[PDB]
Each structure stands twice: as C-alpha cells, then as structure tokens.
Design a protein around this ligand. Structure first.
Ligand code: HEM
Ligand code: HEM
Lengths: 507, 507, 135
C-alpha cells in the first residue's frame, strides 16, 4: 500500500538523450510583467553576487560566485519546487480548489507550500521534524497552515517518521493529496527548467565548478543534468552534513552521530529523485565550520544567508583550491537568515552548544575587555525620592552642578533615573508643570550591574539599555531566623562614559 | 555647535520649477550588470504586487497595488537611502575609506548602513531607541556594527536622545561623521530619483492615489514631489501613529498616549526633510489596527511585511473608499517580517499587549476547540523501565497488542516513549542488537499535559513536540512535615489521535 | 464516568495523625483525601468533617493515627465504565474510587504492578453533574 520515498529511480534519462524524448511538460522561463498579479510570480530571476573577501582570505585564485537563492518570495530555495509542484498538480487535474495539501518537509518547502495555499485558498498541513527552528513554526502559524511534528531521530520508514505521519494523515483525512517533494519529478524539473537556465545565462555559458548542498536532491540533480547537457566542463560537487549517508563512496559516510544541527540538508535515506550518477565528488561538512562560515559570510559580505550556505562555502573553500586564475566557481546559498534568528546568529546559543569557545570570542576583543567596571570613576552622591516636585529637582541639581541622579524610595528600591536636560526640555515644551512629581519623567527602565563584572560584560549590557546602574546589595541578619536585605546605587555609566574612559586610558 | 534636526527646510524648490535648476547631483537609474559585483547592487527594482482579497473584503472598488520594498538587500525600504548617503558622502569627499560612521536611526537605516560599512570597510556605530526589537540588535551585532541605545521616552532635544547621543559621540571620537538621515538632502533624493521613477513607470503613470507611512519624511516627500511634477492628478496621503505630531492640521494630534508600539514611524519633532506642503491629507493609526492588518496581509496575501505595512493598509482601506472602479491606488510597505519574529507575529505577545482578544481568537476556531482533553479515549495500560532490552520490548508489545509504551524509571520520572515500528527499523538497520537496551531508541523529548486542559491547548502543544503525555500528580504525605510526590502517564495523545477523535465525532 | 469532574490532587498515609490531616485539608482547601500506603495500596477514605465530629465526641485524639477514622471499605471503578455502572456500584457502597492500573516490566519475565487514584465520586457528585448537564 504505502509507497516508500527510497524506491529506485524509474526515469529512463541518460546523458546525451535528445530533449524530444521528455515525457515531462517543460516550461520556458516566464517573462515577469511590469506588475505581477500575485506574489507567487516573484519566484526566480535571483541575482548572482561575486564574493570579494572569502576568496582572498583562503587562497582562491578563481572568481567565486554565489547564487543568492534566498531573495525569493518565501525566503528560500524551496520556493521554486513548491510553485512548480502546485502548477503541475493543477495542470494534471489532480488538485481541485479547496483540497487539503499535506507535505512532509524540513520547514523550507513548508513555508513555500503554505504561502501558495494561502494565496490560492488551499488548506495546508505541514509535517516537519522536531529540531526545526521555531521561527519556521511562527511563520507557518501566521500563514494559517496547520503544523504537526515528529521526533528528531525516528527512522525514515518508521510508523511515526515525518513521511510516515504524512502518509497516514493522507490516508485518514478525506480528499487530501501528498505532493511528495521526494519523489515528485516536478521537484528536480523545477530547477532543471528555471535555475539551471538562469545560472548559465548570467555567467554566460561558462563555469568551471559548481558547489551545492543536497537535501531532497532536486537542487543539485536538476542543475547538474542541464549543466552536463549544456556545459559538460563543470565539475559537480555535493555537500552533506556528517551523519547523513548521501555521499559516495561509502567510506566518506563512516561516522556514528546521527543528529546534526544544520537544518534542511542530509537524510538517513537516498531520495528517489537524487541522481548520484551526475555527481563527480562529495565532501562532508561538520557543524562548527558551517556556522562559522555562515557568520563570516554575514559579517564580511552582507549576505544574510543561513547555515546551509555556511556549509556550502566551507566546502567550496576546500574544493576550489584546484582551480586557477580565470576560472569560475559557483555556490548555491539556499535560505535566508530569517529562519535562524535564535540559532547561530545569536552568540548565546553558539556558546550554549559549544560551537564557539570562549577564547575565540574574547581573544580578538580590544585591550580594555578584561578590565573590571571598578576601574571607572563611578560616582552618584545624591538621590531623590520619586515624590519630589520637578522644580525642586531643577534647583537642587543645578545648585550642585549635577545633571542626573538615581531615584530611590525610602525602602531602598530603585525606580529608575532622571536627567536634568530632559526635565528642562519638558518644562520648555510644557509637558510637565514645575510642581509635578518626577515620577512622570523618570526613566523606568535600566540594567543592573556589579563591580566584579568586566567591561566586556558592561558593553554587552549597554547594547540592550542606555543606563547601567552599578549597585550593591547587603544582607542584614538579626538572629539567623529573622533577616533583611537592602541595596544601593554607586554611580551611573553609559556608552559615553565607557568610551571616554577608553579614550583617556589609551591616549 | 549642535545643528538641530528640526531646523526649517532651507530648500528653494517649489512645485513647477525646472529640475535643471537643482543644485543636487541627480543619478539616473541604470541596469546593473548580469552578475552583481557586491550585494549592495541588489537594491531597487522591487516588485509591485496586486492586492486581491484585502481590497474586496472592505468593498474597495478600485484596484489596489502595493510596492513591496522588503526585497532589498537589507530587507527594508531604508537600503536605498543608506546606499545613496554613502555614495554621496564619498563623492563629495567628506568620507574617506576607513573612517567611522555614527548614525542615529530607527534600526532599519541602522541595518542598511551597517551592511554598507561591512561590505565597504567602515567602522559603524548605531544609535537607536531602546524600545526597538532585539531582532534588529541581533542582525546588527552579526554584522559587527557597534550599538548604543537611548531611553524611549526622552525628548528629541534632551541630552540622551538618540539624535543627541549621536552628536556627543561624534564630537568625542575623532575622524567621525554623521550622515544625518533626517537633515541630509540625499535621503529624499534617493526616493525621488529611484522610487518615483520606478513607481510611475511600472503602472505607466496612470495612478490616482498614494499612501506611505511617514518616519524621517523622505519616504513620502521624495515620491510626492516627483509624482506632482509628472502627474499632479494623483493625491498624496500620509499616515502617522497616534502620539506623534507630524500630522496636520494640529487637531489630529490631540491625544495623550505618548509611547506607541509600531516601530520606526512618527516622531516627537518635525524632521527638517519632511516637506509637509506636499501631503494632501493625513490620518492617524493606532497599534491595534496596524497589527491586525499586518496579520491579515500575511495570512491572506503572503506579503511577509512588517507592522508599518499594516499601519499603511489600515489607512488605504479607509481613504480608497472615495475612489471608484478603474482608478488605481499604491501603498508603500516599508520592511520585512524578519524584524518582528518575536513581536506581533507571536500570538502570545499580541494577547499580552491586548491587541488580540480571546473572543476574536476562539470565535474563528472549530467546534471541538473548547472540549476537554478528558473527552479523548486516552489510555496507557503498560510501561517499561529504561533497562529492558530491545528484543523484550519487541516481543512484549506484540504479546499485549500495543505498539507504544511510556518509559518511566522506578522512581516515576518519565524519560520519554518508544514505539514498536521504530525498534523494528532500528533492528533492521543494525543500530541495536536485540540484547541492547531501549535507552538508545527512546524518543527523549515530549511535552507534559494535564487532564483539565482544553483541546485548544493540546493543539497548541502539538505544534512544538510530537508527543503530549497526559500525566497526573498525587502528593503523598506522612505527617504534614514530610511529603512525597509522584506522577504517572495516564495516556498518550498525538496529532493522529486528535484528528481521529475529531473525525469520529463529526461523522 | 470519564466525563465527570473527578479529581484527587493529594493523599496521605494511614499513619498520619488526625491533627495533621485536620490542618492539611483546610490548608489546601480539601475536605476528603485518599489514604494510601507507601507501596500504593489504597486503604480507604478520610473526611475532615468526620474527624472533627469524632474529636468533638472524644472518641479519638489529635495524636491518633487517621487509621481509626478512615472509611476502610469502598468500591472501585474505571474511566471506561458508564454512569449506569457507577450508579449500580453506588447502590452498595458510598465511595466509588476512579483508579488506574499499570504494569512496569523489566525483562518481560520480571514484572511489577502499581495503581493510583483518579478522583472520588458519590451520589452527590453524580446528581450535581446530572443537574448541571440537564440545565
Ligand atoms: C530528457 C528525456 C527524458 C526522458 C526520456 C524521461 C523519461 C521518464 C519517464 C518515462 C518517466 C516516468 C516513469 C514512471 O512514471 O514510472 C520519468 C520520470 C521521472 N523523470 Fe524523466 N525523462 C526525461 C527527462 C527528465 C529530466 C530532465 C529530469 C530532471 C532533471 C527527469 C527526472 C525524472 C524523475 C525524478 C522522475 C520520477 C522517477 C520516479 O518517480 O521514480 N526526467 N522520466
Ligand atoms: C529646482 C530644483 C531644486 C532646487 C532649485 C533646490 C534648491 C536647494 C538649495 C539651494 C538647497 C541648499 C539649501 C541650504 O544649503 O541651506 C537645497 C537643499 C535641499 N533640497 Fe533642494 N532643490 C531642488 C530640488 C530638490 C529635490 C528634488 C529634493 C528632494 C526630492 C530637494 C530636497 C532638498 C533637501 C531635503 C535639502 C536640504 C535642506 C536642509 O538640509 O535644510 N530639493 N535645495
């Protein structure tokens, strides 16, 4: 009954066969009109950007180009196959309006299918593994699609693998269809018809090597078939995270870990679509290099690309050592950074997973990084109760030369801070009467810091708040059964003060 | 010393003067090369996408078009002005390579300038209000630009306002510059040269209205001036959140709530560049309608646009009531959803801020939404210790006629679950010998639910973790001084079971 | 019976003193909790009002173990059971305990069994639920 995604390929295609033999309905690239009826037409025509600093930093003689595929409507390279599959299913008459579309996907195809369904009125149900980032979950909830999850490490053929769950859902809900991104020939055909033509028509029909990451296999197979038909000189390479078994020869695969952090690439089975015969070499990519290269891309070229692009460029910097001056290398950057905001893009998560060690984070920072906050000339002699009137603060502050003072209640609980200039400006604008209490103008937000913490911690705090209050806390005991506690402000500090201290010490 | 951003516009332009009199250097649009030398060339030529459902939902007779400006390199409509400002500063010789740029901005221009500096090699410092989302902070930190925050409720001319802290930092650090997105003539000129010529050329100049939220004021000034010079018949409509003083006549600004949730529009001072003589009408727009319309856009059209897009469509659905069939309207959607992933896109945050009300949420849900999970046929007759061997489980589950069983240690702490078919697949794959323990193949993650919760809570849980275990707690006491607690897995519920129950009840 | 408002958040050992139950039930808002041994065997029920009445009568002392006041006998029911079966059970005994049964295997040769209590129900609760549904 159930048809597996691991079935051997049944296509009769082989290199050199004339295009007339195709039983598939090829579509020539469509000319996007001046105004396009639906957002779905903004798929394709993506730009190719030459990398400038990664090439030199790692001894690349050749010109290195990146096919930025993450500027599509849904922000992924999985927006071509979704649209193409929907188009083919509608043209073949299988899909009627109002039907239910179930798709087992690693998120990226899910967003594309949900977008297409929302535009065209279909109901969409998405099944994706557990490890997918929560940003995809949020975007799918917003797009109105219904989500179902499956365990991280369930084997592909198990009753509760994402493919299996999708199958049983399709066999349970009435009038539903699984487009089956793994087996549907429209998947590789989408790239073979649109992506390959654009790649060859931008670089103008010549290129030495192509580097690509392999998930469902359409990305690489669809491009490679057209390239070998039209430009055989290209060396097709594939990337695959350490843990998945796509790569050949089997020796490359020998490792035990099965769960890897990079999302969207690598599988525990060989997809039906993937045509490994048109792949001339393979490399295995770990996670540390993938995330480091993603961060390096973001920070040195402005390409807001995800981790899979990091793996792609990390493999490219190795494979492309073979090339020489005048040669051209291409990388496919699948998806946008949007889906990884809480992941590697965040330093906290990187340290938590250990992909970046503390020495790597600290060794490059300026000289003053390890100085304690104690080294600053912090001082705040006076504090004002929140009930004091505006004019009282104006006179009391300008009489003593100060222009800002912490606000603390009699109990010692800090409420915020007040700046003389702000009160003066408000009075000039009439937003507060001189008799009005400071509670109306006090800044109610700030961050609390301690003496022992380094200036690096202070700088990482000031990126979130303006006023950092150096404070202290004292526990006051009575009998070991009756106790009390109190705290107090030392002196305000801001980016201005820290920068002035750095300038003074360094000069 | 300090030049205020509210200084009156010294420009001599008035509607009708020939452009040849302009003292500014105009740059005509041109076709970028087939491969972009660097990412920044992928700015402009963004698509105009027709709006289908939102227009009819409120009975708008006219055809409604949108200018999706969130496909720029930085994902915003503030990558045009950043590039233009950098280009003009370089052309006039003010900025030398290696100089430091400091810019007070509402994030979006911050991201654009940080990207430009990262690509072209400048040290960049961004000053932004404290209230802006941490998504922009993360994207900036990844790009390497330093960040400084300011209190949200500080008056524009106070010492610690962003436009003030920027000035103080500029006076402090040597060889530093402020491009001043507020005063600089490049800001409006960018849109006047690129955006307007794109708009009036895409739709062939036959448009009747335009809507564009107002921040710095360039967005509307630069487009309205060119539209009136080319096609004065088109009305120009601004927008502004309640609590800002940009709208005229003054009576529209009469409201008392200062802070507002929408990010990046509306200011407590009139920007020098904001040419209010070319704004034919004004509206206000609170936060509730802004976010509601943003969510409606995402769900019903697929335009992954941010809050300001909602604040603009909420006004366009009012103003466009005056048009009739045949006429055309244009809206300007500033930024992408990428900046608000944890904000309005999150239902929890919307409910917390009160923009969503439980009635509007539940009234859309199906009938079974409010039923208790207690109504399901949940059950869990057996369980196993983690030490049991794989073969023992394989035989015992088939003996008892089940397929999955909770795994709980003797102390009652639940470890996870395990399923028959997954063990069979593991045995076939050799990952476990029959003598091996189930600790290898257990699904080590799940979410805990209680009998009282409604099926809506269960459906929200199932979007994150596959297995929802219906646990129960009994606290066992001995003398009111010694206490003990334990829990057990009454039943296991998954999306499949929920759908089965729904179908059975419905049929 | 799975559709009733059954519940039983906490329970006590029979060895707990009468005063301890007296204080705990009012402390946490309950009036009757199951009495269960350390191994999980259900002995019976105890009620706050009955403890108070017996203390007033002088038949027990606050230091006395609740084992004296427990309602040592009852009948047992399961979720699948219909309300009709619950009514038939209540015709013979006051307390009907909704309980659970589980088997915790170790090697498919070695096995152990344990049980716990869902909640309590009486004619009062049954009639209250009937009225609440009828209205
Ligand atoms: C150019 C001449 C081609 C011929 C003669 C050919 C032949 C066929 C035929 C007859 C089938 C149907 C098999 C079935 O229904 O069981 C098929 C399916 C398929 N074709 Fe082609 N094809 C051609 C081009 C292509 C191209 C260009 C691609 C991709 C770039 C492609 C990928 C596929 C895939 C993935 C399937 C589905 C295999 C499966 O479902 O197991 N084919 N092909
Ligand atoms: C006939 C065409 C124009 C003329 C004669 C003209 C004239 C001028 C002059 C003389 C200045 C310098 C003012 C000063 O230094 O104080 C100026 C600045 C400026 N112009 Fe124009 N301009 C023209 C077109 C435009 C256009 C097309 C735009 C925008 C789309 C524009 C917006 C501005 C702005 C924002 C400033 C800066 C004002 C300030 O910073 O205070 N002008 N213009």
């Amino acid at each position: 009954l159930w048809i597996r995604p691991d079935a051997p390929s049944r296509c009769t295609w082989q290199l050199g066969r004339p295009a007339s033999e195709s039983p598939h309905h090829h579509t020539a690239p469509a000319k996007s009109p001046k105004i396009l009826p639906d957002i779905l037409k903004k798929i394709g025509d993506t730009p190719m950007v030459r990398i400038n600093k990664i090439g030199k930093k790692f001894g690349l003689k050749c010109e290195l180009l990146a096919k930025c595929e993450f500027f599509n409507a849904g922000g992924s390279v999985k927006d071509r196959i979704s649209l193409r599959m929907i188009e083919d299913a509608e043209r073949d008459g299988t899909l009627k309006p109002g039907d239910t579309i179930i798709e087992p996907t690693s998120g990226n195809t899910g967003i594309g299918l949900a977008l297409a369904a929302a535009v065209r009125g279909y109901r969409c149900i998405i099944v994706m593994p557990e490890k997918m980032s929560s940003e995809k979950v949020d975007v799918l909830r917003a797009l109105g699609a219904e989500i179902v999850r499956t365990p991280t490490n369930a084997r592909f053929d198990s009753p509760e693998s994402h493919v299996g769950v999708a199958w049983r859902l399709k066999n349970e809900i009435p009038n539903s269809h699984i487009l089956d991104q793994y087996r549907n020939a429209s998947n590789p055909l989408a790239h073979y018809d649109t992506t390959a033509d654009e790649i060859l028509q931008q670089c103008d029909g010549k290129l030495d090597m192509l580097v690509a990451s392999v998930g469902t296999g359409g990305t690489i197979t669809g491009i490679a078939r057209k390239l070998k038909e039209k430009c055989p000189g290209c060396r097709i390479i594939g990337v695959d995270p350490e843990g998945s078994i796509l790569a050949e020869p089997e020796e490359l695969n020998q490792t035990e870990q099965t769960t890897y952090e990079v999302e969207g690439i690598g599988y525990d089975f060989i997809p039906t679509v993937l045509d490994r015969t048109v792949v001339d070499k393979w490399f295995k990519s770990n996670d540390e290099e993938a995330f480091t290269f993603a961060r390096m891309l973001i920070a040195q070229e402005g390409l807001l690309c995800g981790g899979s692009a990091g793996s792609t460029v990390a493999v490219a910097v190795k494979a492309a050592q073979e090339l020489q001056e005048g040669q051209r290398c291409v990388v496919i950057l699948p998806d946008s950074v949007r889906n990884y905001m809480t992941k590697f893009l965040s330093d906290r998560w990187m340290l938590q997973k250990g992909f970046l060690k503390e020495e790597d984070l600290t060794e490059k920072k300026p000289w003053w990084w390890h100085l304690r906050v104690q080294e600053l000339g912090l001082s705040a002699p006076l504090t004002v109760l929140p009930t004091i009137t505006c004019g009282h603060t104006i006179e009391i502050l300008r009489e003593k030369g100060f222009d800002q003072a912490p606000v603390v209640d009699e109990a010692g609980v800090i409420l915020g801070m007040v700046t003389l200039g702000n009160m003066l400006s408000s009075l000039l604008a009439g937003k507060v009467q001189p008799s009005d209490q400071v509670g109306k103008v006090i800044y109610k937000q700030f961050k609390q810091i301690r003496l022992t913490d380094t200036l690096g911690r202070l700088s990482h705090i000031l990126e979130m708040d303006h006023f950092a209050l150096v404070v202290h806390e004292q526990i006051q005991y009575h009998s070991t059964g009756k106790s009390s506690q109190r705290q107090m402000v030392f002196g305000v500090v801001t980016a201005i003060d820290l920068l002035n201290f750095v300038a003074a010490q360094e000069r």
